[PDB]
């Protein structure tokens with residue numbers, strides 16, 4: 001329904017002004033634990049899914065916490081509105097972590113999707129402000145926003161050109177307002193497809209890229225890899 | 240593994256070696272109304288837990304008409320050239336269950352993971368399972384077995400198939416240089432595919448007829464009967480981890 005998107009855009013604007021894109025008292029030296037969160041959905045069951053939240057030790061990337069919970073969905077997926085799908089499983093998993101093992105609450109969270117790379121209010125930023133936690137947006141594919149002058153063919157063209165120069169990080173700039181939206185980064189060996197890091201909450205883009213680089217073993221950062229792994233495994237355990 | 244076990248297995252493969260029929264006889268492709276597949280999926284966390292799956296598909300439409308999965312207890316580890324002893328017992332249990340529950344869907348031929356005649360003692364798992372069950376089988380391997388005693392080296396076969404692919408071909412005879420007998424055909428029947436699969440005669444079927452059946456069973460690189468059995472066996476296995 002179009003009524004639902006009309007309230008969602010107003011929801012994106014109210015939280016737009018709330019997202020903090022500065023580190024403040026936070027720094028890379030403060031990072032002792034980094035958390036990951038992912039949701040796996042069932043193709044055979046339209047409303048059944050499994051959420052998973054993990055905590056890994058920084059920078060050794062040793063998994064120290066993992067919990068998986070069966071989830072009931074009330075929202076379908078729509079581009080630029082990913083936040084509303086996973087906000088409740090994230091809040092549910094976050095509370096179980098603070099209750100079961102409160103010492104393992106990580107300094108920062110890695111979330112699937114973008115944050116500032118969005119109405120400037122991606123799911124990573126949306127979940128961060130509503131939960132009062134430090135989040136980083138990491139997307140495996142490029143969101144396209146023609147309203148900001150970013151297109152997929154141009155980003156991959158200048159990135160492949162940047163690759164010819166020998167680089168590995170490329171600022172993705174909004175053609176309007178001249179704002180850096182995300183960094184197309186490549187921190188893993190034997191990888192050519194870039195991931196897109198964007199600021200989530202209580203953290204800057206430049207610092208977020210460093211944290212993602214520390215979490216990088218293969219193309220997918222370890223916190224996202226583990227959360228993706230266990231969520232899918234448990235979903236196929238209850239079919 | 241034990242050396243008495245390897246010596247006892249070699250005598251069993253030699254006993255069965257000459258009992259494999261690689262001729263069509265009164266068999267033809269037109270007779271194939273159903274084609275069966277069989278695969279076993281194993282658990283890495285449990286050394287003795289596995290799930291066997293047998294499926295039957297309509298030929299040539301490749302529509303699944305039968306599927307069963309059974310929990311399996313293993314009494315054998317995997318060793319190359321001895322796959323038969325690993326999967327012989329679950330296959331006969333699956334064949335017995337199919338012949339008992341729905342005997343009208345018993346297929347004319349089975350597609351089995353691994354080789355048949357393409358074997359060091361000419362008694363692969365497809366042939367071994369075929370003769371010990373009195374069923375028509377075809378050996379289909381996803382990777383190339385190397386037999387140095389027959390002059391089969393992987394680098395020379397894949398390079399020879401690479402040149403044939405550039406010429407435009409799709410079938411390559413794999414010949415034992417020592418015996419001058421064709422052991423298998425490296426075939427490529429799927430679009431957007433360059434890595435070949437290796438079809439070899441199993442039992443009660445010729446090599447060329449087996450290749451025709453595999454071509455009819457080809458949708459993607461993996462033939463549909465093997466694809467379905469592989470899929471359902473692993474899916475059911477992941478329910479018991």
Ligand SMILES: [Ca+2]
Nearest residue numbers: 038039040112
């Ligand atoms: Ca996700």
Ligand SMILES: [Ca+2]
Nearest residue numbers: 038039040228
């Ligand atoms: Ca996922």
Ligand SMILES: [Ca+2]
Nearest residue numbers: 278279280352
């Ligand atoms: Ca197998």
Ligand SMILES: [Ca+2]
Nearest residue numbers: 278279280469
């Ligand atoms: Ca398999």
